């Protein structure tokens, strides 16, 4: 799909058997999801944005189905206000910006 930007670019995702809504975010290098129990081994990490930093659990090789398009990669889990699909996964589903 082609998505205009008059509204937030929210898509439906499937991760860990759970269904969520997530913002397709070209301003995010990596994917950040609100707290969830994601199976696997994880390493602590810190990430920063507007307003400061949050502590997240770094998970590698996580399967996510983004708008029906499958991708595997690093997924950060922590206290983000919103689920964010970052460029690490946008590249796998072939997402481009167009103007």
Tell me which residues are annotated as active site: 25
Longest Cα separation, the chain? 40
47 belongs to the binding site for ligand A1CM5 (CB under 6 A):
yes
90 belongs to the binding site for ligand A1CM5 (CB under 6 A):
no
Task: Tell me which of ligand A1CM5, a second copy, none is bound by residue 75, counting a contact when its beta carbon lies within the kind-specific cut-off of 5 to 8 angstroms.
Answer: none
The answer to whether 62 and 8 are in contact (CB under 8 A) is: no
Distance in angstroms (rounded) separating the CA atoms of residues 89 and 30: 7
The answer to whether 71 and 22 are in contact (CB under 8 A) is: no
17 belongs to the binding site for a second copy (CB under 8 A):
no
Distance in angstroms (rounded) separating the CA atoms of residues 22 and 53: 20
Q: Pick the closest to residue 24 from 32, 35, 15 (CA basis).
A: 32
Choice between 21 and 29, CB closer to a second copy: 29
Q: Which residues bind ligand A1CM5 (CB under 6 A)?
A: 25, 27-30, 32, 47-50, 76, 80-82, 84, 86
Q: Which residues bind a second copy (CB under 8 A)?
A: 1-6, 8-9, 23-29, 32, 47-54, 67, 69, 80-82, 84, 87, 90-91, 93-99
């Amino acid at each position: 799909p082609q998505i205009t930007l008059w509204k937030r670019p929210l898509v439906t995702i499937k991760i860990g058997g759970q269904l969520k809504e997530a913002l397709l975010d070209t301003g995010a290098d990596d994917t950040v999801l609100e707290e969830m129990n994601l199976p696997g081994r994880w390493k602590p990490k810190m990430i920063g944005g507007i307003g400061g930093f949050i502590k997240v659990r770094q998970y590698d090789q996580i399967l996510i189905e983004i708008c029906g398009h499958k991708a595997i990669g690093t997924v950060l889990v922590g206290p983000t206000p919103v689920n964010i699909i970052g460029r690490n996964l946008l590249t796998q589903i072939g997402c481009t910006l167009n103007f």
